[model samples]
Target chain A: KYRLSEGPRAFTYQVDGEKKSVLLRQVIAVTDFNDVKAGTSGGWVDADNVLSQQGDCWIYDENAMAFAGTEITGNARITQPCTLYNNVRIGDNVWIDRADISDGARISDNVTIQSSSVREECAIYGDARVLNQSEILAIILQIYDRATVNHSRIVHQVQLYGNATITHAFIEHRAEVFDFALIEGDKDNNVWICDCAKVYGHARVIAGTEEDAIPTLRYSSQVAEHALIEGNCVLKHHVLVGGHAEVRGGPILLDDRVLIEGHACIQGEILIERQVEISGRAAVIAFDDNTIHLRGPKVINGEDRITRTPLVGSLLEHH
Target chain B: KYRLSEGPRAFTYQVDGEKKSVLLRQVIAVTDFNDVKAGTSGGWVDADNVLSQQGDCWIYDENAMAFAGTEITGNARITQPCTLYNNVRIGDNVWIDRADISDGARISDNVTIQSSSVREECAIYGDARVLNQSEILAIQGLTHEHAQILQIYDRATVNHSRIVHQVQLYGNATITHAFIEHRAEVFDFALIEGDKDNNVWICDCAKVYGHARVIAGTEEDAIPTLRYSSQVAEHALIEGNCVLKHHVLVGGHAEVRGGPILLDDRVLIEGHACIQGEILIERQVEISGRAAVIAFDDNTIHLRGPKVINGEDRITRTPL
Candidate 1:
């Protein structure tokens, strides 16, 4: 009923001419090892301290190493080459050097690393890369590609696949940022987004201003390049908060392929859906609750996001 | 100034028991015949209309015919025993005798009808091949070796692409560039465009229609095809360097254009996804949106269970 131990197997190799033999190890119940079983022998190591004595941690490749320079810990495993210090974990095929990965972190699958603060309950896989002295913490997330980070925290099933350079931003709940998006925050400007949203392809969601703290996840969904979403704007399906647009105010709801990309500035709590492209700069906001649904290749390119306070659907488009 | 003529030399024989004699023609300006000079005697034709009385047309073998009922027009030459007849315009430089052509048909260029019924104003031309027991109906469509009937009468165009076996094309479909030797049907307004060099294949009773365009590529541009009774319809575009086989339905406004990609097994892409770059997207995968999936080099992502990417998901590229 023990945790980690050397294998009943031996390995032979020569360095510069002097040949020597060493022993490898075997595995037991480990989540990080993916699809391996008990009694499965692992790679060569110098001593027991070179690996974690407690939880299931391993090296899968016989030619791979956990060298004298460091010792790995946590439910982490390696296939190529590396060692982890502190509470950080390593997963997948990785090549690393001089990377201080700490604070409840784990990097997984086909990645290379060095000197970065990747923290929180995050399992980094899908070819996502990180570098520099960036403090990245996401309670649940996947950040793909070479995105420079400076104090960015994601919460619950959020991912950033774009090459965005974000700082001081907190993104929460089912949301993704990609395609050259930029999320910036500071002491002066605080960008807070709550609830289901997708920001990508030239987008910015840095507190569209910090007048009040934004809250909740109901709907306003998509936020793409050259656009801005700074509020608890609710979008149900295909709500493109694009252009130099500002989701202007809070609790505004847009649904079903609504376009808000033309430097639009919207303020209100309304539901717009079913192929009604909010073409151009038109302010869709009302004091009471309202709704609008339209059809077509026909559009309003011409809110003309610049519209008067009207509720008539077809007349507004014809005008 | 005539190409050939009954020579001034002739008329002698023995008793074949009792024989008389006759005269034969001589060549003027041509080759593909025995090196007969301006005065050398040629084969015997019963009369003038048996062979064209002008140009470089001649009877090469001692018995090739321009029979009394069949007229050989143009520079049409042939061998041994071939009786060319009916309203047939044997055009250009043709060479064949172990073949049969008849009816309101014209065999032009490097090809002509062989033991085949080429009727209804059909013009079969080019590619050194003899038609085999094939019946052509109403079609300047060129072919090689043996393939029958092309309803690409949507105007006359020569597609040098290889289409053998019984691969049928109808309903104004456009497959100007392809190499299909198997039995496949391309009907309705479908476009079958693939790399002739890639040797792209479309087989297994696969139907291509609904203006669905199939232009496939691979890691090295080879065999990105559609097969296994699969259908590609609608305005859906299937491009990109990928391989799609086995009952995969890629239709609607959905497009798959981006290289080094493979869609194999049971996969269906409808709405739209511009899957760019190399990816292994197959096995119960369905997406319906205009998301251009430009892949990164190390694609550590696969289908869930196996995988499913919603159409709105744009898989981006980091330059590589």
Candidate 2:
């Protein structure tokens, strides 16, 4: 049973300040519900496109208005301004503009709710704002303060608080991202932040470049304090890569109980496994599995044919 | 020119203790140079399986006959009536019956070689059989018994394992004594070998690569497989009977053993979140606070969707 509620309708302000109209909706038939048994008069809608089909979704109060080009598909409940617009998906998304009210957060400048989404399971509070190319399929996630999630897929159980910026990336699993951490991506070969990896404290994970692809963070391997994780670097196995360390180039393998911190730079076809702690102005170039060219503290101001072990690269002189 | 000094006969002992008279032919003259000199009294053969106009490859000893559909190219000596067809280039004491072989292959048993390549000193012997369209290069070990459908490239090794029904063994990955079937894969330095008589089953679309090890356990029921589309990469040990399906990704040395742990939808359980014992978690749940084991008994955490929506995050100013 579905029908319109009659005239308690008005116009809502656009980003350009031009107001749009709202048409009242009521119950004419019963459809699509596990809850909300029956209703005589449903909520309010602006155009024929707003409440085009029916409810399992509703515009809650008389003060709230559903805009044009915005159709509700699943279970969406709107109070104050609106938290569901053109949702048409799995019970989520609401746009924030000049007239639209977001969780006491401001929707400033140029932003639309058509190609983007703010799901019902998401909380966008504080002075937080979504800017430009905003497309987030949030599942039980939070976006607070100056933290912006643009053109990314937060595949449930991810937290975005503080000034951390995540763009063109895919954050899956329960990865809590905080501080000024910058995670980047958007390529089939790269662009994944998964497996409970913590990236905060001014760390940058890169992807989606021409030479860079398939870069990732898995197995709880994280970048602590200040560091960089470029594409094709398999940082895994709870290995802590902190400080000014930049792990990039080639498909480098890092697992086991290894620690790479300080002014370290990993390059070439290198494999650092087991309890190996790499620090200082150290760099390695592995030419195949044998023959490693290492650059570290001067053992005589030249390439030292040092100790042989299960580890791939050989230690060399830094001076 | 060479002529056959025919009418030489001998008695070869058969299995039934009967002496069978065998007709022999001898190389009466030399027509070709290199390896064989002008010998009117050369070798013996039942048929001309060897090219009389060839160099390097030869039909050595009168007792050895090169049969039909078989020719020797380089450095190959035949000692028995083993039928080899369309094979060029070298090896010794290898028997191939009505088998199509080409290039320098050290084959120990039967394998069908189509337009696919097999080269670079790859050792494929024992119970390893290539059924269709094979690509084996620099294989250091055997791609053991019942290995029908697979593309093993780039220094990959397999031993005592049974791989069938389409599997991709790539990189320096190795699988030993395990039943690997279906469209499952082991790529990029992943290993499936643990203990003697290792029993690890990796089936379905589940892949374990990037240094992950599917360690085999004793007995059949103690084995673990990354089934469904449930992926386990990055040095994670996937053991026991764990149910990881519907895009449930596990990584980070996370040892997931035992438990018919059912993790479905997009549940990401990483960082040592070992799902041992029985547990059912679904509906976009993220269990990666690291070291948390959801083990033992009926603990079903079905993370449901949102209950209600609040109208906030709109305007600014102050909040008390």
Candidate 3:
């Protein structure tokens, strides 16, 4: 239940001298006023509307198509489908096909894009989401909910928080994805996620399991508790899981339509599959056969007691 | 004043069980006593020992190496200044050259040795120091201070609380010198011992800190520091008699040595080897270079610090 659609307030004019009226999305139309501005029959266009130029271009705004900032010289084309209440700052190569942006952003140094998006960057006053189609450089990008990115390519600085979602991959400059995170990179090179309290593969998350703490990656796996399911991937089992837990990655905790309830716990060494729902005060540890159970920690208060170098490196899979 | 010229209890033993009596320090000898049959070699023997059989062997009186709960069998040899008293037990391949084993002993599993040694497993009280050296069984070995093994193939393990010196490279089991608080492992093609804490070496201490914690191959001037003169790995001079207050020297502040004294008012980040007075600081813990902290409560302290990725993997000298 949300609605904030009002429209139009566009303007231009004022570079070196004579600064009359300036508020048309803060105006930065660097020369070649396209026949003195005003198109789509010239009327109302301000939800922070942005119009840019580099040379050869195209822009047809009948009514509401918005973006906050852009500094260009020529080249730009948008036949309308825009909604950028805040961030959409651009510099180099620009191309847009369907857009929606709103979240602390700073698209850096060498930028290139095709399809646009931005969402998810919660807390610090929650609410952010970012999406994309192609290249991006030295980014500050912060987003919260509803984040979708497609056909990706990024370099330096990326921070996406809360309900994060991605479709393709190629990110450099310290990549980071937080909360309810989801990253999809298909087309072989399979996928790779790096460092600090990691969660893995053909990815999907809901945030919050606690290792170093953040939202983590929540979608709500009901509760599989005590945690650290190491790298590799695959986790589908459920029925509320619980402390010092690691269900390793290579993703596949088979989802036989989720069911396990009580003190939820799982550490299936590496990969998991088939009729998931490892029930109640759960503590499932399968050390080998490709080391499944990737995450750890689950002792709901009762300390889920189980020690001895993980039962002596699971000595030949003790019983 | 480290005297044990020979006098702990003066050896004596006569306990017949199955079969095991006397000998070690004598070139390998263990008369096979077919399982169960009263046995007693009645008090001691010296040198020429290397007995090997399926277990059961004992020879004491390098001054009745005191005993409490003794148990040792299968290939046992002892040479050099020996001693073992109170609760002693050993099994599987045991050999000691120039030895000194003290009270509360329990040595088990395949073992061998050569030169100056001492064993005091947790200060005596049902002790055990098992040795089955076959290159340390391929990996996973740990050691700390005092427990010499000339050669072992792999899978070595140790935790000598200070005093296990001269561990001759035996098939990959390495734990060079001493001063180790906890975690230790020297596995498969292993080589460890990167000195700090309290100046320790392997051959002139390893010739100027003999390969301890990175010498020779990770050279920071062949690595080894407690500096008294060699300007202690120079950082520009004052004739650099170098003393930067021990625990890994610091620089500039005119060379503040004398056993640490750099508080600079509870410091957050200032140089001059800051350690500060009453201790009581904890908020991020990332104190820069040449360390020596010593705080305690307020959040916890005590560090000798050194190694923040070795100043970008040192080449010649520059790991202040």
Give model 2's clash tally: 33
Best by TM-score: 2
Identify the runs in model 3 with alpha carbons over 4 angstroms from their true place: A1-226, A239-241, A249-319, B1-320
- lDDT per residue as tens, model 2, B263-308: 6777775543334445556656554422234343454333332111
RMSD of 1: 24.8
Off by over 4 Å in 1: A1-319, B1-153, B156-158, B194-199, B216-219, B291-294, B304-311, B314-320
Candidate 1: tens digits of C-alpha lDDT, residues A39-97: 55565555566566654455555455443424555545454333333345564454333
Alpha-carbon deviation at A161 in model 1, angstroms: 30
TM-score of candidate 2 to 2 decimals:
0.34
lDDT (C-alpha, whole model) for all candidates: 0.50, 0.50, 0.31
Task: Name the lDDT of candidate 1.
Answer: 0.50
Once fitted onto the true fold, the runs of candidate 2 whose alpha carbons sit more than 4 angstroms away are A1-115, A131-135, A138-140, A186-190, A208-212, A286-319, B1-320
TM-score of each: 0.32, 0.34, 0.26
Q: Give per-residue CA lDDT, model 3, range B1-320, as digits (tens).
A: 01122222233433325433334222222343432233322123332121223444444323333234444456454433444433444555454433444443344443333222334342211111221111111111246443433222322322222323232232222333332222222222222233222222222122111111111111122222222211112111111011122123222211121122222112232222223222322222334432323232243333322223111111112223
Sorted by TM-score, highest first, which candidate order results? Answer: 2, 1, 3
Could you report the DockQ of all the candidates, in the order they appear? 0.01, 0.01, 0.01
Q: List the candidates ranked by lDDT, beginning with the highest.
A: 1, 2, 3
